N, CA, C and O atoms as a printed pandas DataFrame, in Angstrom:
     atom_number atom_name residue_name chain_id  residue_number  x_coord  y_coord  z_coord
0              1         N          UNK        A               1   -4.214   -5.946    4.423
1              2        CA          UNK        A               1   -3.706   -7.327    4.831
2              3         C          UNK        A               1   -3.582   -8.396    3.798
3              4         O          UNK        A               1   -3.561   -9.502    4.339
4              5         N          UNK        A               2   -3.506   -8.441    2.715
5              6        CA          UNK        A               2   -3.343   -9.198    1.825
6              7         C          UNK        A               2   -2.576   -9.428    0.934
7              8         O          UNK        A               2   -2.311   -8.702   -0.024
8              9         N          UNK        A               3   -2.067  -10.703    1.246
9             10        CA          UNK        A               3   -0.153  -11.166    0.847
10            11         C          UNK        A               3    0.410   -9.834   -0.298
11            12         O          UNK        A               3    1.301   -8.985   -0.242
12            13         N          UNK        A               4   -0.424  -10.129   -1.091
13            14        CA          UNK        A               4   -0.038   -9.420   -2.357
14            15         C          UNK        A               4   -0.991   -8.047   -2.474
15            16         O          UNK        A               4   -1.637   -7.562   -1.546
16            17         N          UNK        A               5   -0.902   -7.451   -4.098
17            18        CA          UNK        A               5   -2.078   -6.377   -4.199
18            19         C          UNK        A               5   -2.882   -6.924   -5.783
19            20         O          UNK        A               5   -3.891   -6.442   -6.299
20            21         N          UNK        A               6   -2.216   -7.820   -6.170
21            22        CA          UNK        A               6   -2.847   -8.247   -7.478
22            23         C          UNK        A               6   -3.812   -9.568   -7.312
23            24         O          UNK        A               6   -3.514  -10.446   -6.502
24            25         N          UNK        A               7   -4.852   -9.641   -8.039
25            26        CA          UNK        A               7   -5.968  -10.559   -7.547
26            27         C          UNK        A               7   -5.549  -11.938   -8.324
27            28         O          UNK        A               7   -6.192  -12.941   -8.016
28            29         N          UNK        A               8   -4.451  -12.070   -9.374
29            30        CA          UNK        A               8   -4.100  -12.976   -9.509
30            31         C          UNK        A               8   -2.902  -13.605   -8.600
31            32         O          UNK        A               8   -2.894  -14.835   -8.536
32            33         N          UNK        A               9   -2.056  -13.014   -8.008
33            34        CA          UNK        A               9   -1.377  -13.007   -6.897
34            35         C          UNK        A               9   -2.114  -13.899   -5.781
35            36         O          UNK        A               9   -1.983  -15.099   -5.541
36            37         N          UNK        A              10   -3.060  -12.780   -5.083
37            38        CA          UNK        A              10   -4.005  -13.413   -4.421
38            39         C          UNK        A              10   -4.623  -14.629   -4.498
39            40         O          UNK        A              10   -4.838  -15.350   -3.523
40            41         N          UNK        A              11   -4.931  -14.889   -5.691
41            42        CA          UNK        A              11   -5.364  -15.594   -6.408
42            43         C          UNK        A              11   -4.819  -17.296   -5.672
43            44         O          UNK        A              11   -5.201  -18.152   -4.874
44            45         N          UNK        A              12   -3.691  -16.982   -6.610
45            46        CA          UNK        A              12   -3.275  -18.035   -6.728
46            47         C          UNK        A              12   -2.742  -18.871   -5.335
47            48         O          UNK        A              12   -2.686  -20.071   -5.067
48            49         N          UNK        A              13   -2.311  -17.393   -4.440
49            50        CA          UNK        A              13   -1.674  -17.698   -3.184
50            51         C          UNK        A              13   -2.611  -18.203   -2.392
51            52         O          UNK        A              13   -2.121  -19.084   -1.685
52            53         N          UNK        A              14   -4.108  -17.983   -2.134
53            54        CA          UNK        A              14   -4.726  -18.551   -1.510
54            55         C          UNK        A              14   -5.014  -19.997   -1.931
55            56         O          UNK        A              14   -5.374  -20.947   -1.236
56            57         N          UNK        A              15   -4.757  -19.919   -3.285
57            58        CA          UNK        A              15   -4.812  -21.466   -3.772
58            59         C          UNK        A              15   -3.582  -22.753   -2.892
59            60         O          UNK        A              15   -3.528  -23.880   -2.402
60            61         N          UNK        A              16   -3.015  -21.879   -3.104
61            62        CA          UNK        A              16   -2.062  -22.756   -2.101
62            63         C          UNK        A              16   -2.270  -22.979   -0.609
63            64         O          UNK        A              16   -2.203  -24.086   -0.075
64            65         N          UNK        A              17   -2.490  -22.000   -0.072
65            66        CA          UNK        A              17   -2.806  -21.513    1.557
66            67         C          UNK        A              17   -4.072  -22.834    1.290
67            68         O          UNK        A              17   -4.031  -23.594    2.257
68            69         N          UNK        A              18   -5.004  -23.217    0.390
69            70        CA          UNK        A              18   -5.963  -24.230    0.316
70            71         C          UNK        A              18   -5.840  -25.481    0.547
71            72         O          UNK        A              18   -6.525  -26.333    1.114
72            73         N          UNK        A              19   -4.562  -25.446   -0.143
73            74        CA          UNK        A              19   -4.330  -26.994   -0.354
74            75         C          UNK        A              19   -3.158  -27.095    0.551
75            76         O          UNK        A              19   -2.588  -28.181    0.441
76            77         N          UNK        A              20   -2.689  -26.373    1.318
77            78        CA          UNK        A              20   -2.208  -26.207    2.955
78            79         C          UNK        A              20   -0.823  -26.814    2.233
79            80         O          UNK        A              20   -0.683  -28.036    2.189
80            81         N          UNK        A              21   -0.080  -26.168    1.821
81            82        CA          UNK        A              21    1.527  -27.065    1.808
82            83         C          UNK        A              21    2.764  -27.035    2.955
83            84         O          UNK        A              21    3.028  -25.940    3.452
84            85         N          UNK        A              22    3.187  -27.696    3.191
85            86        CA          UNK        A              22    4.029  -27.513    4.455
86            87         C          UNK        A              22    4.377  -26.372    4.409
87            88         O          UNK        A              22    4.160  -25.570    3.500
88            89         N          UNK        A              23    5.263  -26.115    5.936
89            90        CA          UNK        A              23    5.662  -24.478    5.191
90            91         C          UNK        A              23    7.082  -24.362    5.071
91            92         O          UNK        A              23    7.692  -23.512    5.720
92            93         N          UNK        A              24    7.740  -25.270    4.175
93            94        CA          UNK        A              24    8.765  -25.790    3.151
94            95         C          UNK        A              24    8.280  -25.511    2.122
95            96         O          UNK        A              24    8.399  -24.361    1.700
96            97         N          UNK        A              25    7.503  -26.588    1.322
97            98        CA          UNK        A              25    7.109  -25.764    0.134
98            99         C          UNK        A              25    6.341  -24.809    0.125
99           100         O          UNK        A              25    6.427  -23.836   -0.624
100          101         N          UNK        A              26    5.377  -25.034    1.102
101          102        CA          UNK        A              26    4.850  -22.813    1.371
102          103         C          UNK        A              26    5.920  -21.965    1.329
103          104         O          UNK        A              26    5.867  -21.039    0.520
104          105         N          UNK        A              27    6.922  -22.090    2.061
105          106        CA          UNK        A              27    7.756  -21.017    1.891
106          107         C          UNK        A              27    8.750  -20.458    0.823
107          108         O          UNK        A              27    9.409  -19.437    0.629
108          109         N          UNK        A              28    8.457  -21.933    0.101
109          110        CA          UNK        A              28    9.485  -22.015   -1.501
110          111         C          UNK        A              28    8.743  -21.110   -2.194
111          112         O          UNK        A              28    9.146  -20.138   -2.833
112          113         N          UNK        A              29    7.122  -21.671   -1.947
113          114        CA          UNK        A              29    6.477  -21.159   -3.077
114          115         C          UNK        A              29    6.894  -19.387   -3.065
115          116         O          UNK        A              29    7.567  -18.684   -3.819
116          117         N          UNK        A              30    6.080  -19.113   -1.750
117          118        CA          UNK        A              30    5.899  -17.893   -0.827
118          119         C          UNK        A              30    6.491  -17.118   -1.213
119          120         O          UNK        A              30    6.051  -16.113   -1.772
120          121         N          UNK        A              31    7.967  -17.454   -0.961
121          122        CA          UNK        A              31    8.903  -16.846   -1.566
122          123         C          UNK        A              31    8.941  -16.669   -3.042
123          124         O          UNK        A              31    8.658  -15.579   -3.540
124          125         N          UNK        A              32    9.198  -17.451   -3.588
125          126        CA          UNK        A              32    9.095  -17.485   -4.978
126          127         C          UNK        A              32    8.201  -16.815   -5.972
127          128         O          UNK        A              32    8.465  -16.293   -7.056
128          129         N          UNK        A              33    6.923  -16.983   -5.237
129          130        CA          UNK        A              33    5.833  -16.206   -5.734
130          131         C          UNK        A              33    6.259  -14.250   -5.091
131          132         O          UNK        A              33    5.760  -13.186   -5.458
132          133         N          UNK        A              34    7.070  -14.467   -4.319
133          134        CA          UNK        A              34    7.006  -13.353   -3.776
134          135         C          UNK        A              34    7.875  -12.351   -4.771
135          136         O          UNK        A              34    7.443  -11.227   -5.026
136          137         N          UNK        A              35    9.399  -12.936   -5.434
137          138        CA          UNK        A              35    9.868  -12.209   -6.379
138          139         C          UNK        A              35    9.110  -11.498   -7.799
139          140         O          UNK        A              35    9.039  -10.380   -8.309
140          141         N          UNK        A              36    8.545  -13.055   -8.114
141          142        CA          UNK        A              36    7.269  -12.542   -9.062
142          143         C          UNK        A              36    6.309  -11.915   -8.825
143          144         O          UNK        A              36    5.598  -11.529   -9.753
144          145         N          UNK        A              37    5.930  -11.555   -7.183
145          146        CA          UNK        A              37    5.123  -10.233   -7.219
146          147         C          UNK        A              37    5.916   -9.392   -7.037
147          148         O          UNK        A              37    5.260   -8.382   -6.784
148          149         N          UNK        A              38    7.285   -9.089   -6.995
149          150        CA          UNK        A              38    7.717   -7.634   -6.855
150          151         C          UNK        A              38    7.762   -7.311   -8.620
151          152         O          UNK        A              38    7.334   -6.280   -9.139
152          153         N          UNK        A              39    8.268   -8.246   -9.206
153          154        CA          UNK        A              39    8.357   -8.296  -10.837
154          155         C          UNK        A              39    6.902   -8.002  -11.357
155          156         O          UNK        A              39    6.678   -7.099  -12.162
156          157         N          UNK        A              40    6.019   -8.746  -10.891
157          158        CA          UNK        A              40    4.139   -8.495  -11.303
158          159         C          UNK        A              40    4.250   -6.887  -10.103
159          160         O          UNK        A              40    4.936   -6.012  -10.632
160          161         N          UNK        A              41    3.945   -6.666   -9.334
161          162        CA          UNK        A              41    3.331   -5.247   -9.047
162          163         C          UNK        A              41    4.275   -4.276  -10.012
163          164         O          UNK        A              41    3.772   -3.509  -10.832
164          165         N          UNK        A              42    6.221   -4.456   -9.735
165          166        CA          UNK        A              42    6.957   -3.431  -10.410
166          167         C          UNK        A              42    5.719   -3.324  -12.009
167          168         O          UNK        A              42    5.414   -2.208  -12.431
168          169         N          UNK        A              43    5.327   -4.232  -12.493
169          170        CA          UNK        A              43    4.588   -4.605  -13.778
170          171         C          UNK        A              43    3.589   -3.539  -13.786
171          172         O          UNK        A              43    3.675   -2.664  -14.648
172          173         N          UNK        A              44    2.262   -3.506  -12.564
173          174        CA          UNK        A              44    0.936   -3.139  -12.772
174          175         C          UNK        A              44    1.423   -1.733  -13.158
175          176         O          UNK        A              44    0.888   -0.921  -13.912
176          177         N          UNK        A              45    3.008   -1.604  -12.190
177          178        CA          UNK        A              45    3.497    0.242  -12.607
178          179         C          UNK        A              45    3.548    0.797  -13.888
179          180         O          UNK        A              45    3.184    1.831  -14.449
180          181         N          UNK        A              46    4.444   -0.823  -14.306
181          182        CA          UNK        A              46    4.945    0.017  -16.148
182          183         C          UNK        A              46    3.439   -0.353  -16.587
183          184         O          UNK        A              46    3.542   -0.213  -17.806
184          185         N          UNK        A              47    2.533   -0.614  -16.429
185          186        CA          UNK        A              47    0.871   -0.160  -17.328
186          187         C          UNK        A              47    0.730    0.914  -16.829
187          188         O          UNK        A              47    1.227    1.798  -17.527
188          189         N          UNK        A              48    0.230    1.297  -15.841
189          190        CA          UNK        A              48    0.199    2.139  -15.086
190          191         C          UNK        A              48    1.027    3.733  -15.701
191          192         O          UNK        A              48    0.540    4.602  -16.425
192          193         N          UNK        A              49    2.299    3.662  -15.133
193          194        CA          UNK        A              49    2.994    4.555  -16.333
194          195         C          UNK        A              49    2.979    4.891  -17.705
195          196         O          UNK        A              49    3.302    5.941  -18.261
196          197         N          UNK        A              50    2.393    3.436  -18.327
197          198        CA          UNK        A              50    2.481    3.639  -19.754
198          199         C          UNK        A              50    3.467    3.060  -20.050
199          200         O          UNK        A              50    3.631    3.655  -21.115
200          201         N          UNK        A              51    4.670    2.066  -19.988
201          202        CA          UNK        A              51    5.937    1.764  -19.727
202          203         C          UNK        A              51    5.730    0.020  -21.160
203          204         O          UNK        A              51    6.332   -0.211  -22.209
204          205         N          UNK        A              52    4.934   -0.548  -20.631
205          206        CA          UNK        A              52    4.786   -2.068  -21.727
206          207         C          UNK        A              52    3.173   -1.614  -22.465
207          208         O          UNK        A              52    2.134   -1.240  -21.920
208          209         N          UNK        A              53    3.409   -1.770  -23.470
209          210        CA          UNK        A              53    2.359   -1.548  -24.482
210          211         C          UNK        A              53    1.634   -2.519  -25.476
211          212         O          UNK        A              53    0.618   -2.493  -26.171
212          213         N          UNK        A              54    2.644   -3.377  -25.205
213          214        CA          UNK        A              54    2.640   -4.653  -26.085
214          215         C          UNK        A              54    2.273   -6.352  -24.972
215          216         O          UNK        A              54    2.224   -7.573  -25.120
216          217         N          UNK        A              55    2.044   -4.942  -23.543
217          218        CA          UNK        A              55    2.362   -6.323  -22.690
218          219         C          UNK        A              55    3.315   -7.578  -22.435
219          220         O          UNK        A              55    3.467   -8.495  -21.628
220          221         N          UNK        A              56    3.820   -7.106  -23.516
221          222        CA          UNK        A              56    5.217   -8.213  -23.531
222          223         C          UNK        A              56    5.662   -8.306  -22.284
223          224         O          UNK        A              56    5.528   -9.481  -21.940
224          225         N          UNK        A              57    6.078   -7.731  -21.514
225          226        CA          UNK        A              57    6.427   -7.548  -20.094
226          227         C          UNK        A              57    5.765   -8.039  -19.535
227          228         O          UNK        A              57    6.328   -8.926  -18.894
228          229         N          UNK        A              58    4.417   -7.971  -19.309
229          230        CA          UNK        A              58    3.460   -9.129  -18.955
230          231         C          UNK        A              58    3.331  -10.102  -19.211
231          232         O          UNK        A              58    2.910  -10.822  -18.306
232          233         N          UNK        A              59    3.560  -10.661  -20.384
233          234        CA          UNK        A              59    3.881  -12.157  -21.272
234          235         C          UNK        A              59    4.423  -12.467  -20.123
235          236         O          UNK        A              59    3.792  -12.858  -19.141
236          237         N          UNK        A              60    6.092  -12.244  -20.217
237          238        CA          UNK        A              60    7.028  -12.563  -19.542
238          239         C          UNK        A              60    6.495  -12.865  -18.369
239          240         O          UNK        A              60    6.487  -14.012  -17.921
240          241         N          UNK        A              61    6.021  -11.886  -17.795
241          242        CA          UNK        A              61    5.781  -12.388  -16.256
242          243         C          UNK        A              61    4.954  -13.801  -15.504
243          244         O          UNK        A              61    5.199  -14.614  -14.613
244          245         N          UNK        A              62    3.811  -13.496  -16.509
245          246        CA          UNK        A              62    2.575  -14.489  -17.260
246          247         C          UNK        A              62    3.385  -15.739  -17.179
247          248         O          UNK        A              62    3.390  -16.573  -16.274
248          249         N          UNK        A              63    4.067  -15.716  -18.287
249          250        CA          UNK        A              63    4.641  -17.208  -18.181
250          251         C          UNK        A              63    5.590  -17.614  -17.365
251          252         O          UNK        A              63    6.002  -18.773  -17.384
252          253         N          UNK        A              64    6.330  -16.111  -16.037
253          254        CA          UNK        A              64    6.988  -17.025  -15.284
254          255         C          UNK        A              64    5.889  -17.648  -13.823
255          256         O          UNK        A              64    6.048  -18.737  -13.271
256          257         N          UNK        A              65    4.862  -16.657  -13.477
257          258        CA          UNK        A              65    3.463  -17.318  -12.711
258          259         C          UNK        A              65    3.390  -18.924  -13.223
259          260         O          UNK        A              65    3.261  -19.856  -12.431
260          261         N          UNK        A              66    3.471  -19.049  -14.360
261          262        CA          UNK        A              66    3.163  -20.410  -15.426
262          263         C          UNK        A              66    4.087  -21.247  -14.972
263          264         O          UNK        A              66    3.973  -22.196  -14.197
264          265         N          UNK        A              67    5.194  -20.732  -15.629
265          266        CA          UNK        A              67    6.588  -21.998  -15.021
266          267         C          UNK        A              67    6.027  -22.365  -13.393
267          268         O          UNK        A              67    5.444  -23.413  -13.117
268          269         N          UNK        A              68    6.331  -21.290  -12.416
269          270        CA          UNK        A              68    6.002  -21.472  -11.322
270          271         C          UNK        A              68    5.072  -22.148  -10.750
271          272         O          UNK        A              68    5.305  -22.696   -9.672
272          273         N          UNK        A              69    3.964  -22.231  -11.297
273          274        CA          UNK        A              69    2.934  -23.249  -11.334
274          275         C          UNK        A              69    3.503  -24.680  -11.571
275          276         O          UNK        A              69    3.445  -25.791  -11.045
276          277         N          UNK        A              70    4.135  -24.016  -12.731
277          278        CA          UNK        A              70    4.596  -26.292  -14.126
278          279         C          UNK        A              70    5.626  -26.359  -12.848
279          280         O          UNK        A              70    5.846  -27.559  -12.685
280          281         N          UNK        A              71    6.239  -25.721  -12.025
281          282        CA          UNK        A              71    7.087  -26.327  -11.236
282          283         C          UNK        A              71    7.107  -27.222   -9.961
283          284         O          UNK        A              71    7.802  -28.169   -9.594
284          285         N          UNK        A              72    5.615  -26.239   -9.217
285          286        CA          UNK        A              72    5.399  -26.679   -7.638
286          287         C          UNK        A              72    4.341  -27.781   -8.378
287          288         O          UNK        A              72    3.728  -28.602   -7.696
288          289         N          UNK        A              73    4.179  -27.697  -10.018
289          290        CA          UNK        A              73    2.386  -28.657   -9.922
290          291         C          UNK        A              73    1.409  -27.805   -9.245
291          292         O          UNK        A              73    0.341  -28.414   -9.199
292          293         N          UNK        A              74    1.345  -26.916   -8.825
293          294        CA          UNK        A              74    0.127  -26.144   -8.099
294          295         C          UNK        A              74   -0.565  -25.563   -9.630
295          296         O          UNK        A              74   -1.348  -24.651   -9.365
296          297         N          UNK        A              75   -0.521  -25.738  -10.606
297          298        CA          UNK        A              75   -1.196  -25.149  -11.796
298          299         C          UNK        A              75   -2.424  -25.182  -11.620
299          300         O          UNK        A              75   -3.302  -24.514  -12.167
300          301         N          UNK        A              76   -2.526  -26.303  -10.514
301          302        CA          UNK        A              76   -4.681  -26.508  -10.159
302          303         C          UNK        A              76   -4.819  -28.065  -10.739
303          304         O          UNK        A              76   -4.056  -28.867  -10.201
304          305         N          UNK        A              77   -5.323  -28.362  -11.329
305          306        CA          UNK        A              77   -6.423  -29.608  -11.762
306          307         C          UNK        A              77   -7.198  -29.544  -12.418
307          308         O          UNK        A              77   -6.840  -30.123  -13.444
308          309         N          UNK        A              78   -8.277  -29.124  -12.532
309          310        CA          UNK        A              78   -9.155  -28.940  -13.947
310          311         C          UNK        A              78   -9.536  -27.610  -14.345
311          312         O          UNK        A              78   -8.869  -27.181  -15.287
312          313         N          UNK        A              79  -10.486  -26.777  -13.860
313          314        CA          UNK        A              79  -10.171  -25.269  -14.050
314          315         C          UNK        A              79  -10.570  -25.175  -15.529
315          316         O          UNK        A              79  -11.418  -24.359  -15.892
316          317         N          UNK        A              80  -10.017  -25.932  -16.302
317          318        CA          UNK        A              80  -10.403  -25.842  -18.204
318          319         C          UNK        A              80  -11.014  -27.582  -18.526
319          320         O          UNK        A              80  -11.152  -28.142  -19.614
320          321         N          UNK        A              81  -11.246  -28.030  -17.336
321          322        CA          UNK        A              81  -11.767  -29.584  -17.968
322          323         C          UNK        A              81  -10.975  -29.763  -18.857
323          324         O          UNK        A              81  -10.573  -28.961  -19.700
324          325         N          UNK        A              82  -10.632  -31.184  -18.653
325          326        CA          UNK        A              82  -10.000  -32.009  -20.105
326          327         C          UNK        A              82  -10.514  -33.382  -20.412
327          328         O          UNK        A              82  -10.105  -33.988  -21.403
């Protein structure tokens, strides 16, 4: 039962489900987050396979979770203190 299968997935999605966003931008996110988990699980495969070695493929993905974050602002709040 759980949206995703990756614990940063999870992760993050319950972060949202937290901070309760309508379900407009829930569903932007939802969605949104949802391509990037077919792109992040297709991902856990190519490790999995042996397929990204350099993780670069993960970079990529990494920083689109990131954008996606810099976009909705859901990046969190402190988490690293500033």
């Amino acid at each position: 039962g759980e949206e995703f299968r990756m614990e940063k997935l999870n992760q993050l999605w319950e972060k949202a489900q937290r901070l309760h966003l309508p379900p407009v931008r829930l569903a932007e996110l939802h969605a949104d987050l949802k391509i990037q988990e077919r792109d992040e699980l297709a991902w856990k495969k190519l490790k999995l396979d042996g397929l990204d070695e350099d993780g670069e493929k993960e970079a990529r993905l990494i920083r689109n979770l990131n954008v996606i974050l810099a976009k909705y602002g859901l990046d969190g709040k402190k988490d690293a203190r500033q």
